[PDB]
Amino acid sequence: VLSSKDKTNVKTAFGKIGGHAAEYGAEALERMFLGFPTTKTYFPHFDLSHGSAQVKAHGKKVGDALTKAADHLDDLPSALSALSDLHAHKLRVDPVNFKLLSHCLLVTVAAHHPGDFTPSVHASLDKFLANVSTVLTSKYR
């Protein structure tokens, strides 16, 4: 359901990010653990302090997933196959939490790319993350 213009704004945007995706992942994760402390109870097994090797390594995981998702826009469910299963069946991640991380991801992007984070790109990235969220919550449905 992702518009052609939204497909484009997502493509350019992740062309700005690229290898910063891992660095944005970890920052978005800390912003979420600090902004929404309820989300921390899902990672009691990671040191969540700023710059920890675990938050950085997990940030890379998340960033690389979003990178992959950006390249698989007509294919999200299959692209994020192992992940839908994991987040629903195994992790029991509350649907609300994907909105909080999506928000933190937008804050992170805006904070690093003020000139490129136009109202239009903001909108498209919100839609991209909304679709990723949908897919990751889909095994509840």
Partner: protein, 146 residues
């Protein structure tokens, strides 16, 4: 809301810097482009069909300014958000029937606009304190529902 002494100082310090005529207008504008159903409430504002239309609309700017000032009121009465937002609650809930969820979304939209404006200065820590504030504003405005 409970902000630590350090958090209160950080929040007021950051707010003294926000460009009052710009940030509120940009925050209202982005909400309207990113969440198109909110345009339902602003039908006298004319064209809101595209980002260019919303972001070059004087009534959106004038209204964003008053919205940013209202958040500012909350900043100087963090002790009593309920009483600060009581009449506006009547307006938004009894009169306009805005679903309270949109108060949360506009709060977070202001947060991403603060990030856009301040870059690195808008740290994970400062964001977290601003999350406390916008959550408090939203809930105070939703009081006629709950």
């Amino acid at each position: 809301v409970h902000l630590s002494g350090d958090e209160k100082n950080a929040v007021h310090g950051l707010w003294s810097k926000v460009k009052v005529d710009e940030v509120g207008g940009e925050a209202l504008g982005r909400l309207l482009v990113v969440y198109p159903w909110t345009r339902r409430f602003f039908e006298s504002f004319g064209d809101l069909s595209t980002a260019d239309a919303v972001m070059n609309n004087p009534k959106v700017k004038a209204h964003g300014s008053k919205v940013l000032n209202s958040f500012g009121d909350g900043l100087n009465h963090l002790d009593n958000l309920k009483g600060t937002y009581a009449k506006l609650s009547e307006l938004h809930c009894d009169k306009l029937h805005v679903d309270p969820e949109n108060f949360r979304l506009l709060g977070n939209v202001l947060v991403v606009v603060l990030a856009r404006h301040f870059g690195k200065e808008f740290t994970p820590d400062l964001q977290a304190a601003y999350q406390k504030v916008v959550a408090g504003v939203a809930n105070a405005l939703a009081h006629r529902y709950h």
